[PDB]
Structures are given as C-alpha cells and as structure tokens.
C-alpha cells in the first residue's frame, strides 16, 4: 500500500493505523490517547489530519490519524492550515483547565503534554475564566496522584484494565468533572501499576520513589542496564544524579520488555543508595576494622591466599558472568562451588537441559503474546517474574484478537476487538499451591500440593501421548478436567508451557518437559518458558560448579582454609547456623560484595564490590539470551576515598597479585575474551554489545543528555576545582554528554530516548523502524541458544500422591513480588509494601491445632522455635503449611522441606 502525505509518496503498511504509519516515517503528528501497545481510541482528538478523496481535491475532511486505516491510495495532509489550527484548538481546550504548576511538577522535561503543546505552537492564552480541580488520592508507596494535571485521554484506565488486567483504576464522574483513580484510598494492588508513571502523558500518576530525591530528566545520567531483581531480565534505563541512583525508567526492546516493566524492577532500586553499603575495603584484626585502599587490600589478600593450603570460591546467581568467571579463575575449577543449594541447582540444571537440549523452541517475552493456550505448571508466574504473566494476559486476549480478525475489523482499534471478544479467552491452566493473580483470566486453576501438580502434568502428557508414562490414582472428577486441558492444548496451534525452578520440585520440571514433548510429537508449535530465581542463575548454571553444601563440607572438614564468597548472603541457600559455623571454622573468609550482609561480620576481608549501577557485566535471561548491563556512574566522582570497583575487576586483580605479585586493573573486553575462550558454551556473550573501541562516526555514546546542567557547581561543595571526567575504558560509553544519542544512529543499545520535540518517554518511537515493533538496527542481546535437532526422553519418574503425615508439615512457597528478593527487601520504600511475616494454615489444620487466625504459632526448624502469626488459606490443602520465601529468616530453599512442632505460642 502507498499513501500521499503533503503531496509526497510513501510506502507504508496497509494493515496498520495511519498515525503509526506516519510516525514510522519520522513525521510529526501530535497524539494523546493513542499508545502503540494499547490500540487506538478517540479519547482525545489530537491526531487530526485532512483527508482527501482523490489527487485533485481542495476541501478535504478532518479525520483522525489513529482511526483512519493506512490503506492504499489515501491522500492526507498534516501541516495545512485547518488541521494545524484545529490541533492548536484541541491543545488549547485540554490546557483550558490545567494547573499552573509545571516547575513544581514531577514530569517537567519528561511531560508529553509540554511537547505536544510546543509542537502545535500554542503559547498565547485567551481563556480568562476559572479552571477545574480535583482531590487527590493515596495510591500507595510508589504512585503519587495529582488529578488536576489530567487531560482525560483515558490511557491509564485502558492500560490498567484492558492490558494489565487490574481491578483498581477506573473512570468516574461525568462530562467535565471526570475522574481517574480508585474508588477509595489505598494501594494499587496490581503488579504493573508502575507503568502508569510513563503511560500517563501528564503528571497525574508519578513516581513517589522518584518524588523523593527528585531531579529533572536532563540532569539524569542514564545507562542501559538489566534489571537484577528476577530472571526475566527486562531492559531498564537507570538514571542517577549526585552519586546516588534516582530513577529506573523503561528501556525499549521489541523482543523482551517492549513498553512495560513490573513493580519490583521499577521500585527495587533503593538498595544501591543505602548508606550502610561497603564503600572501601575493610580488614579486621581482632576487633579492629581498618580501611585499606585497593592496592593494599590486593597485596594483603594475595599474601593470605598464598599462605593458605587450599582456596575455594563461592559464586552467586546475582553476580555477572564476568564476576563468576573471575572467581572461577581465581580459584581452581576442581574447587569452585556455585552458591546455591543442591536441590535448587539440580532443578536449574534440568531446566537448562530442557532449554538447550529438549529440541523445543523457547520464546522470548514479546512472542509469548502470540501463543494460543498457556499451561503454567507449579509456578506463581505473576509473583516471581510478572512480565511473563503480563505477556500471558496478552496471549489470552489473542483469542478476542483472532475473533475480531475473522470479522475483518482492523487490529489497531481495540474497542471493536474487545466488543467482539466479550470474555472470549484463550485456555489458561495455572497450577499452584494456592491462589494466583492470574485466576481471573485462567480457564482453570489447580490448587494442590506440588507433587499433585507434577502428577497432573504427567497425566496431561500421558493423555496427549501414550508413550509418556501413565499415572495411577487419578480421580474421575480430576480426570474430566485433565481431559478438558488435553482437548484445549491439542486443538491449539501454538501451545505454551511455563514452568520454573521456584516450584521447589524436580518433577514439576519433568512433567512440563513431558507435556512439551508430547505436544511436539503431534506436530504442534509448542514453546516452553522457565522462570528462574535470580537475574543470572541461568548463567551460573551454564558456567556450572558444585553446590553450596559441598563448599560447606569442604569448610568444616578442614580441607580448605580460605573461602572467597562473591556477592552471596549464604543464608538464603543454606541454614544460617551451619553457614556461620563453617565460616567461623575457616581461617580466611573474604566477602566480595556491595551489600552489607550478615556474613560480613567475622569475615577476615571485605571487598567493596559494585552493584549494577556501578559495574559493567553480562547476565543471561531465563529464556537463555545473554544481555549486558553498563555502569551508570563513577562512585569515586563524589567522595573519592571510596574505590568501589567491579567484582570481576577485584577478582582478576587478586588473581594477578596471587600469580605475579602485582595488580592488574584489567578491561571488560579482556574478561569477555577470557570467557569466550575458556567456556565454549558461553562464546555468544561477545555478540550482545560491541567492544569499547566502537564508535558511531568516530565518537562514543553519551550517558547524559546535552542539557546536563550544573557541571561546574556539581562538586563545588567539596572542591571548587572541577575534576577531570571519569574515563570509561571498559565499554562503549562516555561519562559526559560528549557522545551520541541520535535516533538514526547505527546501534542497538540506547541509554535514553530523547528527540527534539519529543522529551517524553514517547520519544522511543523515533528510535524504531516502525513504532510499537522492534528497535531500529536490531535489538540488544543475542539468543545464545539454538533448538536441538532431537528432544529428550520421556521422564519415567512419576511421583506418588502427597499423603499428609501426623507431626510433620510440608512447607509451600508463596513468593511475594515485593518481599521474596534479597535485593528488594533492602530498599526502604518496599518495607511498607511487603506483608507482615505470616504463616498460612488450612481451616482443618487450624481446627486440629486449635489455633484461630491472627494469633501467634510456634514452629521449630534447625532447632530454632520461631513464632509467626497464622492466617487461614482456603485454597491450601490439608497437611501443608504455607510460608513466604525470601523474607528475613525464611530462606527460598525452605520450599519443599518438612516442618515439626507446630505448637500454639
């Protein structure tokens, strides 16, 4: 199809919208109510152009660009007199009742209404009457509400209801006293409410975490990084100022995390600006905690490691590939232990086996939305990694999209699609120990013990293919729903199976692999996704190594007298008393970390590592793709006594001082070469981003905008002499604004989206070849995984039923989004969002114990009787007890374990 804009020919798509066709060509049409991921409505009338019938026409007709199809032979005009003055009138009407509080507003240079008011060229005011006001609401710890700034373009309610599936936001009121919010005052309980900050083109929904310690957009030093909070690895843009990380924004990537984050990754950045973090190397003798610089710490640590008889390195699933490899080179391969439990490592290894050896394609986050029937086995997807759950919601809405496409209505008008749909949902079958947040859209929810979910998966695989092992003891009332799932998955063109290592059982992974293989046997386009625990747990599994238990036995046995723990708390993956005894028995304990953990006490040497804001590194997604995160700022720019170096830098210099008695502050690309030369299966990590000697037309890329203010007074409170800019020799980025952030630049990684006339987060559409699609010049991160030619075998190990036993209790994980991450609980803004430490009991189990809901109970684990308040779980089963993993005192490895002495306190 071809169109004619201003008497100029253009070749656009015919099946898409005219507004997005014009915005894909680099043309500027103002818009408020249209979003590339939310369809098109007429809540504003901002995208008005003048359409003609044939080539020779003068009068025209004012149509909406977002509601006109971009069919073959259209003749539209954008910048004629009538459309321009009508759009000026529309911004005048929207700004007729708008508060005069732009300098005291949170948006400022991030506001879309400012850009579209300037773009339409409306400066003079002739409205002399009174304005309109509304009362504000308390939306929780993350979203500040300022309803007076609203222009009623309905984008927030459309996202929150249609896209996010939330039940909090909504439209109230009437003609002009319209309202967008909650019916009462309270916290937005959806896990995607943080996307309302950038979805709203005005300052209504703003970031409270960025409201505290606020700076403008041009004052932010940005970097492209990867969210370290769970395994989805959503591309983020952290931006800092004055030496502290201030706001994480969305970073566009049309393959993973196009437009929307989750609340955990959006608001769990508070742990990197804690004032109790290690900033300098600290060494203890007796009770004296003295402070060294980098060189003395390396010399002393190399001396003690040389005098030791055996060194062991305990890596972490939160550190980068470079840091874990640097530990793997500091210590031997024969003694290098991944800091995870044996069962969790086994689950991770079999999940990796299903990924890179199951012969079955694993989809990325964007293409989850194209599947036709989703079966989630064991995983609380909406609470562990919620972005896959949002993509599952979109995949469920794909059936309404298909029914609309059968009636030949265009795909960009979502109102007609939702009209045709009317609760027509793709089959979603979620299994969990209790209720999920996906139960409102799921075709069926299976509340059962974890072994029963595994047997359900094995029964599904057997009924889909008789070569799979059979299950004995299935009740016919459950066999009917088994048959329902079987005919739902068999008739699906693209079935999707979701599992993960957080389920706490090997057999759930086995059953999910069996179901995927049975669907692949009958010629279906089945995909599988597995939600891992941490950001780089899959990379640690690819790297491999022993478990944490083997390291502990090596510690109390006495075979190893030196331990180097890289960025691990060591209480989440093993019991606290055993780890404490093993570390106290060790003559030398080194802890390379950026968070003040519990094991840093009685640790003979502490290296102040760097977080994702202050380090460069590579992390592997749950799907297997290896993306890389860049340093945001130099920690030594302000208060230069702190060194705060990269973890791989610390370990490489320690290895160099161990070998040649001299330090070697190496480069990132040297470590990348070492990884791709030593580990053959990690050879793809030199394809995510180019080297540090990569320039677009001879210049680097700027971390900060061209209007970065206050350069000569930023450090003036401690030194009036302006220091030299920090030199970034590791990567392709410069720490000043003397770089390149042009949208038409041959690169894949963008620190921040800014275009002239587009100062909002809606400047990402200038950085893409087509808007709402993939990013221009490719996408960051390469897949690193190829589908095997042949699959695995049918896993014959089918577990038995869960029989409750007297005097013992099976522990079931719950995995809250705001409280089951080690780096998220340390954020001061999350502490009001996590629930109180609780324990769930069945009504029958509570009646047997005689305990009423809300009162304390006492249970003993590792010889420690702890008291927690109970609450009644209707969906839980008898003989089980429920716990929130990841919390303080409740390790994530406690899932699937036993419990004793549930006595009332």
């Amino acid at each position: 199809a071809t169109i004619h804009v201003d008497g100029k020919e253009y070749e656009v798509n015919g099946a898409d919208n005219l507004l997005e066709a014009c915005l894909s060509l680099g043309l500027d049409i103002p818009y408020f109510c249209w979003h590339p991921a939310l369809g098109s409505v007429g809540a504003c009338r901002q995208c008005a152009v003048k359409q003609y019938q044939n080539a020779e026409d003068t009068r025209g007709r004012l149509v909406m660009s977002c509601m006109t199809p971009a069919s073959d032979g259209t003749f539209i005009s954008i910048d004629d007199e009538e459309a321009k003055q009508f759009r000026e009138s529309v911004v005048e009407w929207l700004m007729t009742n708008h508060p005069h509080d732009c300098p005291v507003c949170e948006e400022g240079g991030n506001c879309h209404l400012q850009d579209m008011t300037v773009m339409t060229g409306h400066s003079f005011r002739r409205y002399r009457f009174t304005k309109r006001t509304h009362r504000n609401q308390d939306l929780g710890p993350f979203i500040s509400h300022e309803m007076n700034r609203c222009i009623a373009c309905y984008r927030c309610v459309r996202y929150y209801k249609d896209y996010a599936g939330g039940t909090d936001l909504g439209v109230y009121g009437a003609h002009d006293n319209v309202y967008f919010g909650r019916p009462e005052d309270g916290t937005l309980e959806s896990e995607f409410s943080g996307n309302l900050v950038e979805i709203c083109p005005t300052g209504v929904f703003t970031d409270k975490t960025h409201s505290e310690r606020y700076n403008r957009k041009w004052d932010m030093q940005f970097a492209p990084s990867i969210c370290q909070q769970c395994s989805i690895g959503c591309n983020i843009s952290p931006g800092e100022r004055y030496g502290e990380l201030r706001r994480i924004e969305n970073r566009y990537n049309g393959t993973v995390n196009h437009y929307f984050l989750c609340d955990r990754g959006r608001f769990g950045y508070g742990y990197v600006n804690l004032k109790d973090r290690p900033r300098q190397p600290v060494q203890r003798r007796g009770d004296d905690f003295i402070t060294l610089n980098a060189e003395q710490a390396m010399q002393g640590a190399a001396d003690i490691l040389r005098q030791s008889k055996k060194v062991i390195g305990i890596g972490s699933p939160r550190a980068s590939v470079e840091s874990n490899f640097a530990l793997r080179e500091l210590v031997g391969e024969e003694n290098f232990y991944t800091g995870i439990a044996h069962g969790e490592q086994e689950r991770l290894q079999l999940a990796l086996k299903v990924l890179r050896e199951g012969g079955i394609y694993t989809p990325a986050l964007r293409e989850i939305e194209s599947y036709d029937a989703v079966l989630v086995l064991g995983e609380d997807v909406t609470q562990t990694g919620a972005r896959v759950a949002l993509a599952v919601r979109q995949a469920v809405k794909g059936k309404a999209r298909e029914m609309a496409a059968a009636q030949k209505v265009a795909d960009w008008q979502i109102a007609a699609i939702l009209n045709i749909g009317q609760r027509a949902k793709h089959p979603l079958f979620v299994t969990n120990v209790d209720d999920t947040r996906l139960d409102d859209i799921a075709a069926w929810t299976y509340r059962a013990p974890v072994e029963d979910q595994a047997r359900l998966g094995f029964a599904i695989a057997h009924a889909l293919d008789n070569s799979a092992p059979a299950v004995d003891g299935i009740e016919p009332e459950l066999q009917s729903k088994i048959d329902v799932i079987v005919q739902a998955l068999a008739g699906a063109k693209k079935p999707l199976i979701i599992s993960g290592t957080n389920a706490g059982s090997l057999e759930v992974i086995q059953a999910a692999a069996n179901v995927a293989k049975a669907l692949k046997g009958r010629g279906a386009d089945v995909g599988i996704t597995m939600i891992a625990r941490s950001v780089n747990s899959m990379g640690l599994g690819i790297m491999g190594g022993g478990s944490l238990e083997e390291a502990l036995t090596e510690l109390e046995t006495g075979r190893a007298d030196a331990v180097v723990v890289l960025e691990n708390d060591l209480h989440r993956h093993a019991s606290a008393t055993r780890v404490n005894a093993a570390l106290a028995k060790a003559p030398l304990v080194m802890v390379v970390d950026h968070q003040r953990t519990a094991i840093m006490e009685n640790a003979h040497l502490v290296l102040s590592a760097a977080s994702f804001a202050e380090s460069d590194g590579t992390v592997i997604n749950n799907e297997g793709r290896a993306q890389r995160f860049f340093q945001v700022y130099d920690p030594a720019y302000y208060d230069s006594k702190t060194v705060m170096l990269e973890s791989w830098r610390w370990l490489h210099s320690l290895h160099s001082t161990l070998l040649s008695r001299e330090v070697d502050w190496t480069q990132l690309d040297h470590v990348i070469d070492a990884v791709v030369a030593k580990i053959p299966e990690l050879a793809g990590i030199k394809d995510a981003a180019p080297d540090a000697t990569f320039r677009i037309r001879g210049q680097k890329l700027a971390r900060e905008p061209h209007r970065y203010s206050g350069r000569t007074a930023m450090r003036a409170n401690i030194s009036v002499h302006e220091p030299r800019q920090p030199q970034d020799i590791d990567t392709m980025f410069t720490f000043s604004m003397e770089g390149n952030n042009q949208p038409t630049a041959h690169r894949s990684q963008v620190p921040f989206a800014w275009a002239p006339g587009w100062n909002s987060p809606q400047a990402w559409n200038k950085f893409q070849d087509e808007v709402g699609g993939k990013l221009r010049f490719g996408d960051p991160g390469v897949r690193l995984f190829e589908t095997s030619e042949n699959g695995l075998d049918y896993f014959t190990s089918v577990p038995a039923r869960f029989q409750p036993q007297d005097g013992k209790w099976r522990i079931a994980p719950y995995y809250h989004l705001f409280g089951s991450d080690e780096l998220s609980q340390r954020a001061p803004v999350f502490q009001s969002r996590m629930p109180q430490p609780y324990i769930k009991l069945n009504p029958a189990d509570a009646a047997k114990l005689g305990v009423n809901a809300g009162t304390r109970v006492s249970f003993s684990y590792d010889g420690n009787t702890v008291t927690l308040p109970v609450e009644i779980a209707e969906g839980l089963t008898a003989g089980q007890v429920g716990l929130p993993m990841g919390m303080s005192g409740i390790a994530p490895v406690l899932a699937g374990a036993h419990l004793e002495d549930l006595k009332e306190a």
């Binding site: 909090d168 109230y172 019916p183």
Partner: protein, 156 residues
Amino acid sequence: AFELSAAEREAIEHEMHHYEDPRAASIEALKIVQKQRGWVPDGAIHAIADVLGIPASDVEGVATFYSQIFRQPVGRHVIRYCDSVVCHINGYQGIQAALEKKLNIKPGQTTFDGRFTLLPTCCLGNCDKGPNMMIDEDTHAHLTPEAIPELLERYK
C-alpha cells in the same frame, strides 16, 4: 458495614437472569439499592461487585456516571425541576425561585429536615405541558410560582 437484604439480593439475581452478563444488571442493581435506601452508600459498591463479579471500580464508575444514582445522602423526597429550554420559555426560574423561597435551600442541597432535595433535571419529556417538575416518581405540569407551596405540602 453495608449488608444487602434478602429482597435486594433476590432482585439483583432476578435482574441478572434477564441479561447475558451481570455487568448489564449492574445499573439496575444500583437502582434497586437506590430505591430501597434512598441513595447508594460506599459499601453498596463493593456489595454489587461481590454479588456480580465485576470490579468495584466499574460499579463506582456506573454509579458516578448516571445522574439519577445518588452517592450522597438525600432527603425523603427529591424535587427535580426541569432545566431545559421549553420550560425556560414557559418559565422555570419563577418556580425555582418559589422553591428556593419555600425550602430556603439551593439546588444540589437538601433541607435540614431531611425531607426535600432540590435538583435540576436534563429534561422531563413533557415539554408541551408548561413548566415541569418531578417529585418521587410523580410528574407535575402547567406549573406556576403560586402553586408551589400547595404542591409541596401534600408530601410527607
């Protein structure tokens, strides 16, 4: 502490039977609650959301969208005088001044007895019969300012 009565719940379920969706019965459920208790309180929104299945935000949006769903406590009798054009030509300002003089209130306000609530109305649909005003499902036409205290004193 809102609690739906048995008759209200049976009426809501019976209206739910008439449609393809309980969401279609949301508006009639709000009208049933308004008829029974004079107005729709804050807990009634969650009660309708619980009996139906739709979110409470949708129920609140429906309750605050339509004009004759009162979310504030009103009097025992709602006076609804016509604000439109034909009643402006026939004269509604005289009867509005008469109502304001008799009740000593403003439109949108209620009397201190909790008896009358004065409100304007979009249109009564009885334009050919002079000025129009509706009190408690009873329309009144051919109105004059001098006939307002007589028409007001026959109500409870």
